[PDB]
Amino acid sequence: QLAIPPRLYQICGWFIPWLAIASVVVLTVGWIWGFGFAPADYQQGNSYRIIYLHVPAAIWSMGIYASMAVAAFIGLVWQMKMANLAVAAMAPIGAVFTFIALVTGSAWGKPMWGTWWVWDARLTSELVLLFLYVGVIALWHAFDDRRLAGRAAGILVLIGVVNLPIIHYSVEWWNTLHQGSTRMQQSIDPAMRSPLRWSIFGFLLLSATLTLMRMRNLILLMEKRRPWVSE
C-alpha cells in the first residue's frame, strides 16, 4: 500500500488536471454567488464582502501550517525523505496566503479604523505566522546540500507548532491589556455562510493544486542525477 518509489511524479500527474479544472468551477461559484448575490450588512454597507478574500486566506493560513506538522512528524520519526520535502513544497503557498490575509485585513480596516495599520490580535497573529513562514523559507534556501534542508525545516516547523498556541494566546491577551475590547462581533448572517463555505472549499482545492504542482517540481530538483529522468 505504501511502497512509494520515485513514481510520485507520475502519480501526481493524473491528479493535477482534474484537481485544477475543478479548482476554478467551485471558486467561480464562491466568488460569483457572492460578490453580487450575497446581500450586505448594515454597519459596513457594501463592504461586508471582503470575507471571501480574507477569511479563507486566514483559515487556510494556519490550516496549511497545521498540516506542516503532520508532513514533518511523518518525516522525522518514520524517517521518510519524500514526505519531508512536502514541508518544503507548500511553504510558499502558506506564506502567500498569510500575506494575502494581512493585505485584506489592512484593506478592511480602513473604512472603520481610519488608518491602514493598527495592531490587532486577529491580524498580528497572521503577521507572526508570516514571520515563521519566511523563517522556514530562509532556512530551506540556505543549505547547499539537499536531504538536510528538509530535515532542518521539519524540526523548525515542529518547534513552531509547539510554540504557536502560546504566541497566539499571549497575543489576544496583550491586545486586551492595552485596547480592552473586541472590534467585530462573531456574526456571520444565516444567508451569508454558504458562500463562505464554498469559498473555503475552493481555496482548499486550489491550495492542493499548488502543493501538488510544486511537489512535481521538488522531486526533479533533488533526483536529477538518475536514469529515471531519461524521459
Binding site: 453580487g36 448575490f37 450575497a38 446581500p39 450586505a40 459596513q44 454597507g45 457594501n46 463592504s47 464582502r49 471582503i50 478574500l53 480574507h54 486566506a57 510558499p92 503557498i93 502567500v96 500575506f99 494575502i100 493585505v103 485584506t104 484593506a107 478592511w108 480602513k110 473604512p111 486550489l206 499548488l210 504542482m213 510544486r214 512535481r216 517540481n217 526533479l220 530538483l221 536529477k224 529522468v229
Partner: protein, 55 residues
C-alpha cells in the same frame, strides 16, 4: 436570475467602498497568478536544465 446589485458598473463596482474592495481583490489575484506562473516556469526550466546538462 436576480442579482444583489441593480445595474452595470455604475451600480456594480461602486458601493461606496469600491476602492478598498477592488484593491483587495486585485492584490489577492496577483499573488496567486505569480505563484502559478513561477511554479510552471520553474517546472519547464528544470527540464531545460536537464536537457542542457546532456552535453
Amino acid at each position: 436570475m436576480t442579482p444583489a446589485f441593480a445595474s452595470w458598473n455604475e451600480f456594480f463596482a461602486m458601493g461606496g467602498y469600491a476602492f478598498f474592495v477592488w484593491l483587495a481583490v486585485v492584490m489577492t489575484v496577483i499573488p496567486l497568478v505569480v505563484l502559478v506562473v513561477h511554479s510552471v516556469m520553474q517546472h519547464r526550466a528544470i527540464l531545460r536544465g536537464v536537457a542542457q546538462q546532456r552535453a
